[PDB]
Each structure stands twice: as structure tokens, then as C-alpha cells.
Amino acid sequence: KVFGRCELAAAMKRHGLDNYRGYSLGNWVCAAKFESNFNTQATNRNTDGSTDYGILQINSRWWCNDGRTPGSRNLCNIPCSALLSSDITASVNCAKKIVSDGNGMNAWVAWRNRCKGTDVQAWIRGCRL
Numbered sequence: 001k002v003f004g005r006c007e008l009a010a011a012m013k014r015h016g017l018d019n020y021r022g023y024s025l026g027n028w029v030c031a032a033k034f035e036s037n038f039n040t041q042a043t044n045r046n047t048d049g050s051t052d053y054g055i056l057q058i059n060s061r062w063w064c065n066d067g068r069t070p071g072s073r074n075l076c077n078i079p080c081s082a083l084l085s086s087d088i089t090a091s092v093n094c095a096k097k098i099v100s101d102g103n104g105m106n107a108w109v110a111w112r113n114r115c116k117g118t119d120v121q122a123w124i125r126g127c128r129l
């Protein structure tokens, strides 16, 4: 599923991601834009053999099981394929664990390089919410 911008903002807010660990909704929408282009089916292979999955490009080295990242963890206790669902519940629940793990949203490379420090509230402009 390719979400619209406000559609994704609304889904994230409903699932309690807005202001989670102090990160306003626009931070999360910006992160999703540049991680996945709002596409729940996005995947990307990393140099270490891990893969990033879904709307928030969650990495199999730490967070989910894909059976092909030897020596990795599965800290969200989920198959990585669950992070590709049109329903973003699994991705949001896992993202809450990630952003709580010490480094905040710096876990998302695209957030750190393209969203952090910018006018992220613009990502929810026009949305009813």
C-alpha cells in the first residue's frame, strides 16, 4: 500500500506514535517519506546482509526475523514480512521499541539526515487529525 501523506499521519496518530518519546507526528511522517516513500512494501538490502522492511524501513539485524540475517536479533518478536502489511500496526509497535532503545529517532538514517532539525510540522499541513 502506498499511503497518502495525511492518510499516514492519521494512521500513525491513531496508533499512538504522535509525540511518542517526545517525537511529534511530523517527525514520523517525514521519516516514513524518506525511508519508504510511504510504501508499506518497501525493502532494501544492507551491506551486512540484513534487510530493511516496510514503511519505516525496520532492520532485520535487530528488530525482526527474516531467516536470512545470521547472528541477528528479533527484538520486536515478529517476522519481517509483518512489517510489509498494508496495516501499519506491527511497524508502529516495533518503531516504539526502536525509538525507546537509547538513540531516539537517530535509528532512522533518513530521519537523521533529512528530517532532524527541519520544519517537520509541515509534513502534517492540511491534515485534519
Ligand SMILES: CC(=O)N[C@@H]1[C@@H](O)[C@H](O[C@@H]2O[C@H](CO)[C@@H](O[C@@H]3O[C@H](CO)[C@@H](O[C@@H]4O[C@H](CO)[C@@H](O)[C@H](O)[C@H]4NC(C)=O)[C@H](O)[C@H]3NC(C)=O)[C@H](O)[C@H]2NC(C)=O)[C@@H](CO)O[C@H]1O
Pocket: 035, 046, 052, 056, 057, 058, 059, 060, 061, 062, 063, 098, 101, 102, 103, 107, 108, 109
Ligand atoms: C549503512 C546504513 O546506514 N544503513 C542503514 C541501517 O543502518 C539502518 O537500520 C538501522 O541499522 C542500524 C545499524 O545496524 C541500527 O542501529 C543500531 O541499533 C541498535 C539497537 O537499537 C543499537 O544498539 C543500542 O545502542 C544503544 C546505545 O549505546 C544501547 O543503549 C542499546 O542497549 C543498544 N541495543 C541493543 C539491543 O544492543 C546500535 O547502537 C545501533 N547502531 C548504530 C551504528 O546506530 C538501527 O536500529 C536500524 N534502524 C532501524 C529503523 O531498524 C536502516 C534503517 O532503515 O537504514 C539503512 O540505510
Ligand SMILES: [Cl-]
Pocket: 005, 033
Ligand atoms: Cl508527500
Ligand SMILES: [Cl-]
Pocket: 065, 066, 067, 068, 069, 070, 071, 072
Ligand atoms: Cl536470521
Ligand SMILES: [Cl-]
Pocket: 109, 110, 111, 113, 114
Ligand atoms: Cl539519508
Ligand SMILES: [Cl-]
Pocket: 024, 025, 026, 027, 120, 121, 122, 124
Ligand atoms: Cl509535527
Ligand code: NA
Pocket: 060, 061, 062, 063, 064, 065, 066, 069, 072, 073, 074
Ligand atoms: Na533478525
